[PDB]
Every structure is written in C-alpha cells, then in structure tokens.
C-alpha cells in the first residue's frame, strides 16, 4: 500500500514489531507492505 518502510534488519512475528509502514513479511523479517 506504499508508504515509508525503513531499511532496518529486524526479526518479527507481528506487524507491530516493525517501524513505519513496514509489515512482518512471510520471511519473519520487516519489509515493505502492500
């Protein structure tokens, strides 16, 4: 859905573990959303 997704490397299990507009991807890392 676009937006600002910072490029920190971070393990995640929820979307809330990720900064800005990033989400928790299927790889269990934070990344850009839809």
């Amino acid at each position: 859905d676009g937006g600002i997704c910072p490029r920190i490397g971070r393990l995640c299990r929820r979307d809330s573990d990720c900064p800005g507009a990033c989400i928790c991807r299927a790889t269990r890392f934070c990344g850009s959303g839809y």
């Binding site: 910072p6 490397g9 900064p19 850009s32």
Partner: protein
C-alpha cells in the same frame, strides 16, 4: 543491497556494523570514537549496553583478525526525529574509550570517512540482496547509484510529498540497484569523477518502498545538510 557486487577488502574501512537483540544496522565511522547511523535503527531506544559495534568487517557477523569489537557508551538521536515521516533520520554513537581516550585502532581496515565540505556514488551494506529476501548478505555488497534531483524524486508516482528537507534520493527510476532492509545506517559515499581526489560521505541509508523497484529509488539522509549538527554533537 540489490544489484551490487562483492566489496573489495580494502574499499570500505569506514563501515560499521551494529548488532543488538534481533536487529541489524550499519553505520559510518566519522571519528575514532564516533559512528554516524540512522535514528530509526534506535527507534525503540535500546540500552547502550545492549549495542555491539564492530569495525573492519568484510563478512557479516564474522570475527576476523583485523576486526575490532567495541561497546557503545551513549548515543544521541537528532531531535524532532519522527517515526512517522522519518525527517531528521540520523543518530550519533559514542564508542567506549580507554584511559588514553582511544576507541577504534585505526588500521588499513578501520579508517574514518571524510564528511562533506560529474559525481559518482556507491552504496554498501550487508542487507537483503533482493526485496523480501530471507537472509542477509554474508559478503559486504557495493553498488554504484547516481544522484536523483529533488523534483524527479518528488514526482507523484515516485515518492511524492514524502521527500522532506534533509533527505536525498539516489538510484535509477527503472530499478535494479538499491539499498534494502538491513542496509539502514550504512554509507552512501561519493567521489568526483572528473578528479577522483576524495571519498566523502554524502548519505545515510534510510528508507524506501520495496527495494530496487521501478519508480521507487532509495531515500537517504543528506549528510551535508546536517553537517553543523554532526560537528556540534561530536
């Protein structure tokens, strides 16, 4: 870094690696006791005792003989950094010193990078080599990217109104070459192609939309824009 090559062993003596919790960032040694990174890497305010900085590395999280592992005694995020707009996305790490004020041992593998006072720029980092990749890069990656003007990066189908003063864009609008997750805090260094006399730190890897995708170039913190802030707090 997407679309890069393996960095030469001696081509990146200023890059710092930051390990804590389950997160990873990079940084740039700008003085023996000071590293310049992105503020959003420390967005959750981790305790300085939890941070580990490593200098002189070619391979990610690798304990090499020229490698030097340092603790962080304190850090400072630029004031008014927003975890929403990501304006003012830069922070300073103060490394642990000894009795004689020495932090990093300068060496052929550990050197500070010059700050700003026909231009080629390179971005480097250990992050994903593809958008949504499952794994960080082991070998440090380097890729050449060009500056992109403000009005081309502020176009509505590029980054629009999200590009704020103190930010900077680099890469190709057609895609293929970019920083990515795990590269944050890392350097964007530039040198004048007409003389090639000095490597200077021009950007701090900050954010993007995907990695290496069309009409979505990487966004960087503009180091020359925050020159006075870096000088005052070091």
């Amino acid at each position: 870094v997407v679309g890069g090559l393996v960095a030469l062993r001696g081509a990146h003596p200023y890059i710092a690696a930051l390990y804590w919790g389950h997160s990873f960032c990079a940084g740039s040694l700008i003085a023996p006791c000071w590293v310049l990174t992105a503020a959003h890497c420390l967005q959750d305010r981790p305790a300085p005792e939890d941070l580990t900085v490593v200098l002189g590395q070619e391979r990610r999280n690798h304990s090499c003989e020229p490698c030097q592992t340092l603790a962080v005694r304190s850090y400072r995020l630029h004031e008014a950094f927003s975890p929403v707009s990501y304006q003012h996305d830069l922070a300073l790490l103060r490394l642990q010193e000894d009795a004689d004020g020495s932090c990093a041992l300068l060496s052929p593998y550990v050197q500070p990078v010059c700050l700003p006072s026909t231009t080629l720029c390179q971005v480097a980092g250990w992050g994903h080599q593809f958008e949504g990749a499952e794994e960080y890069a082991s070998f440090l990656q380097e890729a050449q990217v060009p500056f992109l003007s403000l009005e081309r990066c502020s176009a509505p189908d590029v980054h629009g109104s999200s590009i704020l003063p103190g930010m900077l864009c680099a890469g190709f609008l057609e895609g293929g070459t970019d920083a990515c997750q795990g590269d944050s805090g890392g350097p964007l260094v530039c040198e004048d192609q007409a003389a090639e006399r000095r490597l200077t730190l021009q950007g701090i890897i900050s954010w993007g939309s995907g990695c290496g995708d069309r009409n979505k170039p990487g966004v960087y913190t503009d180091v020359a824009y925050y020159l006075a802030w870096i000088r005052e707090h070091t």
